[PDB]
């Protein structure tokens, strides 16, 4: 029942510990690329990220308490959002650019609609000076929240997820109080951060829609879930 017995500092510690590595792409600066090969690079990258995401998800406090079927559903719903918020986070210190990988930094000249929204989100995080401890909270929230309203008297599973969710909220507030924010500022910043999640959901949905407008076996199945 461990998830619900963790302090805020232990929660942050566990989430930072669970963080996936930053993977490299197969981008070659000397090689010429078509729109097909660029999507190929990103598909290859995203597909490899998913494997790490799955193992990261299992280290998110409370996630393994869920049934297997519920774990699948949450990841199916949130995988693109989680990839996006990860991209946006590591792109903060590169204004006007998205750092898909340390060897893959792109501007809007090189989907452009989603790109723009991802840049805006990155700019938004930068202006707020988003902390890493806040980012990992947000990402865990996305994993647990995005599919919670689209699942048989199971409803206890929903209840457990919401309790963990409330905990991450406690953790967020804890972090802002630690940073010396007034009580008013904490509530405001909390709201600001969570409102951004609505945008990330928007970006995910529009991303899928433009796609249906080559993929790996895992991605195809993930894609299946949003149709």
């Amino acid at each position: 029942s461990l998830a619900l017995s963790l302090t805020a500092d232990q929660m942050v510690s566990a989430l930072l510990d669970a963080e996936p590595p930053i993977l490299y792409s197969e981008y070659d600066p000397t090689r010429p690329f078509s729109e097909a090969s660029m999507m190929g690079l990103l598909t290859n990258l995203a597909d490899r990220e998913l494997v790490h995401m799955i193992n990261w998800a299992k280290r998110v406090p409370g996630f393994v308490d869920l049934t297997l079927h519920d774990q699948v559903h949450l990841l199916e719903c949130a995988w693109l959002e989680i990839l996006m918020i990860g991209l946006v986070w590591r792109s903060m210190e590169h204004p006007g650019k998205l750092l898909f990988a340390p060897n893959l930094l792109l501007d809007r000249n090189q989907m452009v609609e989603i790109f723009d929204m991802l840049l805006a989100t990155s700019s938004r995080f930068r202006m707020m000076n988003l902390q890493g401890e806040e980012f990992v909270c947000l990402k865990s929230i996305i994993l647990l929240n995005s599919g919670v309203y689209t699942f048989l008297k199971s409803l206890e599973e929903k209840d457990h997820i919401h309790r963990v969710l409330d905990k991450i909220t406690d953790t967020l507030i804890h972090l802002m109080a630690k940073a010396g924010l007034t009580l008013q500022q904490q509530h405001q910043r909390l709201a600001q951060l969570l409102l951004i999640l609505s945008h990330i959901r928007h970006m995910s949905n529009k991303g899928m829609e433009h796609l249906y407008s080559p993929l790996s076996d895992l991605l195809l199945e993930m894609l299946d879930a949003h149709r």
Partner: peptide, 9 residues
Amino acid sequence: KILHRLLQD
């Protein structure tokens, strides 16, 4: 599903 498998490892 592949997601299903990788989860229960």
